[PDB]
RNA sequence: CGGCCGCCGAGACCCCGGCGCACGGACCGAUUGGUCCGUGAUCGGGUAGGCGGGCGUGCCGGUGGCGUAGAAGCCGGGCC
RNA sequence: ACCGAUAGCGAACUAGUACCGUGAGGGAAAGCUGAAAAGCACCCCGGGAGGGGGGUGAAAAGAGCCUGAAACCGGGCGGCGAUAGGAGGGUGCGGCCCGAAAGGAAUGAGCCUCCCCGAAGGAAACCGCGGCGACGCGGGAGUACGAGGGGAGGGGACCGGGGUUGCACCGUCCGUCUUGAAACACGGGGCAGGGAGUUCGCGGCCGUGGCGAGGUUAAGGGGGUUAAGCCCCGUAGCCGC
RNA sequence: CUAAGCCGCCCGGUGGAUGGCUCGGCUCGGGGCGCCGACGAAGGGCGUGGCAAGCUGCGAUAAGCCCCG
């Protein structure tokens, strides 16, 4: 209600949606994790996030990867383990699963057909520096939106 | 090419006022005597009891707006219409 | 700057009528008077009854493309036509025995303009 | 803005004259379909009506 | 003449198809210009468009003007007249003028305008 | 090096169509003008600068109007 | 005939307030829900913040509240996309894609066939001749063709326009001083708002209008008016003769 | 059904331009009104509300007390 979804073809009979606003996590890492999770099944995405939190599986970086070391295995390449972002997105996914279940859809047939992360409001702060200079020290927040659909 | 948009009768004065448009693409503004003759011939007017109040050309348009009057009688003409218009139209 | 010409619609109509009458009768006096009236306002011709008396003969038709002023003394009987007449000039012309008429009246009386003298 | 007294008088006279022109009155926009004549002269009894 | 009218209409159509869009120099480079596409005369000392170098956008000139006979006419050949009510609609010439209803006119008045135009035989460019 | 032959090559030159400008002419406008015709091999680049016309914005005096059957504003398109 | 929240007083608001300097003193930013709070009862999830349903309202306009532009960021769609070089564009067209309305169009589109006229320009087959040769000359012939201007028949839904990209050729950004700017000369991260020939006095000149050997009032006075608008007077003075 | 990347449209976020509104400013011919204080002024400090911090108003009678209209 307060915030809208970028998905245009929402169908309440077959789809469910959830969101989280003003998350104190990195929007860039949220974007990377959402790009990895797009197009996946809900249970598979939950297992992916669990592995990332447990540090058993790196998330590749395709856009924001400066000064990032490579990882063992094929396709790496820069990668890391955004545990905080993974936890927040896991909470959002659990919420969307609850919404789908309350609607009446089978949780085992849900595919993530839409997932996105946006930059939200910036919480401003300052940090003192040398030669009497006050310099910005800001927190960037993230909005997460997810829409899942029941496949037949 | 004359198309009369409006003809109105004034009994309180005793005249017919005609508002018309002349459509002359590629031709100069028609002369007053030509417009009078064409109007009189077409509308069956009395040539000695009618004047052309004005003919106006507006920028790059080939349609000129004309206003003319036709009084009931020469008495009404001399009573209402003034001296300079009478000299210009040559009815005096 | 550009010359905007006379602002008076009556004067503009008179100039157009003068040109039309000159074309109709095949004479140059009316066109000459038209351009003389069309000359800039700050240079418009001003003529005095003294000059009219000096250079006019009895019973002559005079046309002034401007204003006629009444400084001096008039003795001849002259028919003077001008755009503007001062009150003193008109009184003096009438007393001398001429007529103070307009250019339209002069054209109506003498359409060919034969024998008319232009004075500035 | 200054205006000469004689020029103002001439303008007033011209406006008074133009008041009695049928073509100008109609072209301005006034409705004179039922007006008997122009200029419209009425008796002096009109000056005493206060209702 | 109808033949000359049609020929000049074709000439204007070809000329305005060939005419380019005159735009300010470096209009594509900045959003402040790309969002407001206009033409401004280049006046710099070293401006290539001002110097009229080949390989650069052209500049408007008096030669691009349409033929005088059909200048400003609707592509259909009629002359557009902006109409706001039935009184303005009824003053048109049905043979050679077309009516364009003002964008501000509401549906209630537009219905009456369209009906009057249909029963008078006047073409309407934007019938609702 | 001494000559020749044929081709290719500009916005130059020639031709058709259109625009404007300068000058002259006819006709027509209730404040600078408007339509049309005639001549231009002897009009059409342009910095400083001079001159003429036109487009756009706020408000006032008039005049003619639109709008909850949807004004201003904003976004993407069609036409001139 | 002043401004309309970067404007107007610095302050439309808890403004000479917050705040800076030991001190004289200096001094901001900040307006708007809706007609009515009717300001979301109840259910699922979450530690919470909140999320999803469901309600109120003509419209969420949801208090982070009228409209919500540009820059910027994320996703979806169309086009290109890992052997290709130029300031990111210009001319023409091709590939892919969009194409209801406002442009044309079933009173006929792209397209196919045929006929007539035609400016400047303008071939060749073939025949005869000149030249060592490239080749040229006379006929063909001012013919075929030619910008454009007209007509007839067939078919029956596109054409104009737009986004991206490809190919051929061309193209070393914008403003500025300078003889000379792509410059290894200066000002140039992006966007939105603001931003620079104004007023008075004197004088020269021009466009127009009034009166005219005269022209004109100043301060001020009377009438009338909601009013400072409007009407009449006012010769002191100034210029000219 | 090419990874990053580039341009265009749509949706969403961030931001607060534009538009509309105005109990506030600015400028004015005219009209009105122009000094307070040792009978203690102006300017300040501190208090004062049931829940009361700021502004405003009041002064231990403290967002107030009494009397005619």
UniProtKB/Swiss-Prot annotation, chain A:
It comes from the Archaea. GO terms for biological process: cytoplasmic translation. InterPro entries: Ribosomal_uL22, Ribosomal_uL22_CS, Ribosomal_uL22_euk/arc, Ribosomal_uL22_sf. Coiled coil: none annotated. GO terms for molecular function: rRNA binding; structural constituent of ribosome. PANTHER family: 60S RIBOSOMAL PROTEIN L17. NCBIfam families: PRK04223.1, uL22_arch_euk. This protein binds specifically to 23S rRNA. It makes multiple contacts with different domains of the 23S rRNA in the assembled 50S subunit and ribosome. This is Large ribosomal subunit protein uL22. The lineage of its organism: Archaea, Methanobacteriati, Methanobacteriota, Thermococci, Thermococcales. The gene is rpl22.
Swiss-Prot record, chain B:
Keywords: Ribonucleoprotein, Ribosomal protein, RNA-binding, rRNA-binding. GO terms for biological process: translation. SUPFAM superfamilies: Ribosomal proteins S24e, L23 and L15e (SSF54189). InterPro entries: Nucleotide-bd_a/b_plait_sf (IPR012677), Ribosomal_eS24 (IPR001976), Ribosomal_eS24_CS (IPR018098), Ribosomal_uL23/eL15/eS24_sf (IPR012678). GO terms for molecular function: rRNA binding; structural constituent of ribosome. Belongs to the eukaryotic ribosomal protein eS24 family. May be present in 2 copies per 70S ribosome. Part of the 30S ribosomal subunit, where it binds 16S rRNA at its canonical site at the bse of the body, as well as a possible second 50S binding site near 23S rRNA helix 45. This is Small ribosomal subunit protein eS24.
Curated annotation (Swiss-Prot), chain C:
The keyword Transmembrane does not apply. It comes from the Archaea. Keywords: Ribonucleoprotein, Ribosomal protein. NCBIfam families: PRK04005.1. It holds the Pfam family Ribosomal_L18. InterPro entries: Ribosomal_eL18, Ribosomal_eL18/eL18-A/B/_CS, Ribosomal_eL18_arc, Ribosomal_uL15/eL18, Ribosomal_uL15/eL18_sf. This is Large ribosomal subunit protein eL18. One of its GO terms (biological process) is translation. One of its GO terms (molecular function) is structural constituent of ribosome. Belongs to the eukaryotic ribosomal protein eL18 family. GO terms for cellular component: cytosolic large ribosomal subunit. Part of the 50S ribosomal subunit.
Curated annotation (Swiss-Prot), chain E:
The keyword Ribonucleoprotein applies. GO terms for molecular function: structural constituent of ribosome. InterPro entries: Ribosomal_eL32, Ribosomal_eL32_arc, Ribosomal_eL32_CS, Ribosomal_eL32_sf. One of its GO terms (cellular component) is cytosolic large ribosomal subunit. It comes from the Archaea. GO terms for biological process: translation. It holds the Pfam family Ribosomal_L32e. Keywords: Ribonucleoprotein, Ribosomal protein. HAMAP family: Ribosomal_eL32. Part of the 50S ribosomal subunit. Belongs to the eukaryotic ribosomal protein eL32 family. This is Large ribosomal subunit protein eL32. It comes from Pyrococcus furiosus (strain ATCC 43587 / DSM 3638 / JCM 8422 / Vc1). The lineage of its organism: Archaea, Methanobacteriati, Methanobacteriota, Thermococci, Thermococcales.
């Amino acid at each position: 209600k307060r915030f809208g979804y970028s998905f245009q073809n929402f169908d309440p009979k077959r789809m469910a949606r959830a969101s989280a606003r003003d998350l104190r996590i990195s929007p860039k890492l949220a974007v990377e994790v959402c790009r990895e999770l797009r197009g996946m099944m809900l249970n598979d995405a939950l297992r992916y996030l669990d592995d990332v939190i447990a540090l058993k599986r790196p998330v590749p970086l395709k856009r924001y990867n400066d000064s990032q070391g490579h990882k063992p295995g094929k396709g790496f390449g820069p990668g890391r383990y955004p545990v905080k972002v993974a936890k927040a997105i896991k909470k959002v996914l659990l919420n969307v699963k609850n919404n789908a279940v309350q609607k009446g859809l089978d949780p085992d047939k849900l595919k993530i057909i839409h997932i996105a992360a946006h930059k939200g409001p910036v919480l401003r702060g300052w940090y003192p520096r040398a030669f009497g200079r006050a310099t910005p020290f800001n927190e960037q927040t993230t909005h997460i939106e997810v829409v899942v659909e029941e496949i037949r | 090419e004359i198309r009369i948009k409006e003809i109105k009768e004034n009994k309180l004065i005793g005249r017919k006022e005609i508002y018309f448009e002349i459509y002359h693409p590629g031709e100069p503004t028609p002369s007053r005597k030509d417009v009078k003759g064409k109007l009189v011939a077409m509308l069956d007017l009395n040539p000695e009891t009618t004047v052309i109040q004005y003919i106006r050309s507006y920028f790059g348009s080939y349609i000129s707006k004309g206003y003319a009057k036709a009084y009931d009688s020469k008495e009404r003409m001399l009573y209402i219409e003034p001296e300079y218009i009478l000299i210009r139209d040559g009815l005096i | 700057m550009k010359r905007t010409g006379p602002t008076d619609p009556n004067l503009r109509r008179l100039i157009r009528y003068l040109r039309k009458k000159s074309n109709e009768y095949g004479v140059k006096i009316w066109k000459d008077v038209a351009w003389r009236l069309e000359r800039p306002r700050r240079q418009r011709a001003e003529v005095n009854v003294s000059k009219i008396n000096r250079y006019a003969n009895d019973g002559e038709m005079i046309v002034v493309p401007g204003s006629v002023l009444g400084a001096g003394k008039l003795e001849k009987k002259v028919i003077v036509a001008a755009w503007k007449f001062s009150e003193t000039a008109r009184r003096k012309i009438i007393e001398a025995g001429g007529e103070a008429i307009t250019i339209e009246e002069l054209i109506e009386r003498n359409p060919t303009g034969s024998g008319v003298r232009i004075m500035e | 803005e200054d205006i000469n007294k004689k020029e103002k008088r001439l303008a007033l006279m011209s406006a008074i004259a133009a008041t009695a022109n049928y073509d100008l009155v109609r072209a301005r926009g006034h409705i004179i379909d039922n007006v008997p004549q122009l200029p419209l002269i009425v008796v002096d009894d009109l000056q005493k009506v206060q209702k | 003449d109808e033949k000359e009218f049609k020929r000049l209409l074709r000439v204007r159509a070809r000329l305005k198809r060939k005419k380019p869009r005159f735009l300010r120099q470096e209009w594509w480079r900045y959003p402040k210009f790309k969002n407001d596409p206009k033409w401004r005369r280049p006046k710099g000392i070293d401006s290539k468009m001002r110097l009229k170098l080949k390989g650069k956008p052209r500049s408007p000139s008096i030669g691009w003007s349409s033929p005088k006979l059909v200048r400003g006419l609707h592509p259909s050949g009629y002359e557009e007249v902006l109409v706001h009510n039935v009184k303005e609609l009824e003053a048109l010439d049905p043979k050679r003028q077309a009516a364009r209803i003002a964008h501000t006119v509401g549906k209630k008045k537009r219905i009456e305008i369209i009906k009057r135009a249909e029963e008078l035989g006047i073409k309407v460019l934007n019938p609702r």
